[PDB]
Amino acid sequence: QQAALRNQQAMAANLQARQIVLQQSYPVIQQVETQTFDPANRSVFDVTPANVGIVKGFLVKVTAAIKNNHATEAVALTDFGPANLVQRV
């Protein structure tokens, strides 16, 4: 098939340009939002990222302050544990 040579020549020009961007550009990591809330009020939030360059991922740091108000009994961590702090992304 003659159409499998152009789609391999388009991969060769693409991989030539990938190693130009990764070698001749600057990796930046900057904070876009931070917010502290109470989950009784709201728990779904929207984050507007920065519109610059070639975005290649997000690092999300979630903290919590769980308090047990029971009289005598305790709770224990589940198997998934703190990975259930973000319900959906």
């Binding site: 917010q35 360059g53 979630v62 589940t78």
Partner: protein, 235 residues
């Protein structure tokens, strides 16, 4: 995260997530070029409220964080989040404009989850792969009605093709042996991982491949959660 939170105590938790767009650091496939004028770039996030993070004893601890006899009075005091964006600045500009990996930014790299039901003991349960995606990994969580077991409720797991042909029909201990040479440990009990990074499941150039779980014991309201990871383009 602390292992237990006693009556009257307060536990401090922290947790990090990497939401990927590009496939890796050296492979810019799935990356996003966000230098567009009227950009609609967006990152939604939902968090655990006081109804989904504390399960009672005998409940389903799947989306929960803590579970015990005192979960009826557990509550959050705060949740704080911080988002950091990793990107590449100072792109090479030429005479005709930007120099970019064009069919690397045209490709998406996606992560989806689902939930299937209808499991019967000693009957194969097939979940079909979508024909438009090139699947890279598969994660199956056998949630056996609020109970998780370390392989003692599954006969086998497989990746069956369209005719009837199986490609990896393994015992749950031998299935875990294949993931131990990838992530060097075991996933938690009930979680099963299938790696296809050396040869992705395209299921458009070789038939209709499905994912099979043959269970041994099925409780009431037992479901099978299926996480996917795949490439997507317009070829």
């Amino acid at each position: 995260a602390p292992a237990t939170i006693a009556a009257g105590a307060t536990g401090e938790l922290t947790m990090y997530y990497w939401v990927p767009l590009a496939y890796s650091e050296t492979d810019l496939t799935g990356a996003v070029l966000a230098n567009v004028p009227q950009s609609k770039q967006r990152l939604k996030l939902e968090f655990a409220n006081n109804n989904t993070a504390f399960a009672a004893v005998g409940a389903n601890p799947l989306e929960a964080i803590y579970q015990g006899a005192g979960a009826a009075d557990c509550e959050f005091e705060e949740i704080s989040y911080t988002v950091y964006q990793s990107y590449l600045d100072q792109l090479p500009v030429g005479q005709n404009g930007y120099i970019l990996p064009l069919i690397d930014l045209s490709t998406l790299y996606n992560l989806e989850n689902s939930a299937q039901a209808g499991l019967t003991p000693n009957v194969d349960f097939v979940v079909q792969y979508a024909n438009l995606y090139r699947y890279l990994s598969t994660i199956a969580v056998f949630d056996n009605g609020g109970s998780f077991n370390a392989g003692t409720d599954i006969n086998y797991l497989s990746q069956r093709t369209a005719n009837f042909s199986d490609t990896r029909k393994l015992d749950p201990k031998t299935w875990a042996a294949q993931t131990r040479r990838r992530i060097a440990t075991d996933f938690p009990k009930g979680v099963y991982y299938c790696d296809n990074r050396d040869k992705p499941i395209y299921t458009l150039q070789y038939g209709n491949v499905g994912f099979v779980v043959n269970p041994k014991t099925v409780n009431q309201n037992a479901r099978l959660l299926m996480g996917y990871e795949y490439f997507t383009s317009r070829t």
